[PDB]
Amino acid sequence: KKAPIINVYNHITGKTEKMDMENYLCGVLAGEMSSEFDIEALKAQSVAARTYVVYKQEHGKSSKHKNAVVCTDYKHCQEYKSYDTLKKLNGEEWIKNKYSKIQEAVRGTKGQIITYNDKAILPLYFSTSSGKTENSEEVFSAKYPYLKSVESPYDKYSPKFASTLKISNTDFVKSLRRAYSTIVIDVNNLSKQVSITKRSDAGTVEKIKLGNKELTGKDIRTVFKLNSANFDIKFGEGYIDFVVKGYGHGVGMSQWGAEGMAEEGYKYYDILSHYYTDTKIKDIY
Numbered sequence: 001k002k003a004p005i006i007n008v009y010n011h012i013t014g015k016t017e018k019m020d021m022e023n024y025l026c027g028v029l030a031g032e033m034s035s036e037f038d039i040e041a042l043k044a045q046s047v048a049a050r051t052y053v054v055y056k057q058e059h060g061k062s063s064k065h066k067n068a069v070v071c072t073d074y075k076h077c078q079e080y081k082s083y084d085t086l087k088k089l090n091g092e093e094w095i096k097n098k099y100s101k102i103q104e105a106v107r108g109t110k111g112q113i114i115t116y117n118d119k120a121i122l123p124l125y126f127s128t129s130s131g132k133t134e135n136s137e138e139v140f141s142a143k144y145p146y147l148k149s150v151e152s153p154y155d156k157y158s159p160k161f162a163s164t165l166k167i168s169n170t171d172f173v174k175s176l177r178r179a180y181s182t183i184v185i186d187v188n189n190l191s192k193q194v195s196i197t198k199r200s201d202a203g204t205v206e207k208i209k210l211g212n213k214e215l216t217g218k219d220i221r222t223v224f225k226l227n228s229a230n231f232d233i234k235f236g237e238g239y240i241d242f243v244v245k246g247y248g249h250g251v252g253m254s255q256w257g258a259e260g261m262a263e264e265g266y267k268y269y270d271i272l273s274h275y276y277t278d279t280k281i282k283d284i285y
């Protein structure tokens, strides 16, 4: 068959528009992964992005956009940069010499999706892991046979592998009180009141105690704008330091891991079968 025409919801304008699968996917790669990544990582990424649309088509419509299979909000579906936007911000030379690589990666995987028992998977992906990916159930609510923790030994080379953020004790309590009106916490005794309660083997903080409150690592990531929910806290004199590992949710495919694998000679099928446990590739058209 031919490549489908899909409905894409523009989260800024509120208008839904028809797009050829290929054009949509090029916009997703431009937004998710740079044209500087290896072609095999870009191919892996294109298959994941295509699979996401197919999965969405085969499952329940969302309330955010019931009349569109996907939207342009990276917080809900996946990133998307339009051609006009890319041309205006990067220029014609970038379109002809760099965006062409993105176009070739997408065309190069025409109609290919990742499958588990012959059905499109939920192909979660993120920037950089802590060295191991996360099982879906330690981050999200459900377990999926293809979203299992795997080693990701090349993520250590990512510029987002490690990060640190210093916050004054005063700003730390002020920020928490603003987000949680019931919190009882003392600016002068933070090291005695704040402690990690539950975390996965990969490292995502599931439960953290802050005075009388229990929050998730994701809650903390959100309040303090951290790169991930995998962190540790150092208590200083008058301040705390968040020491953060990786970037993103940690489930499914690591983008920097795919890049590292590509550099080592792995091809996109092997990258995909590594991150998505017991999966195959299917050409639907």
Ligand SMILES: [Cl-]
Pocket: 032, 033, 034, 127, 255, 256
């Ligand atoms: Cl990236």
Ligand code: NA
Pocket: 109, 110, 111, 112, 283, 284, 285
């Ligand atoms: Na194909």
Ligand code: NA
Pocket: 225, 226, 227
């Ligand atoms: Na940030």
Ligand SMILES: [Zn+2]
Pocket: 064, 065, 070, 071, 072, 073, 076, 077, 078
């Ligand atoms: Zn969406």
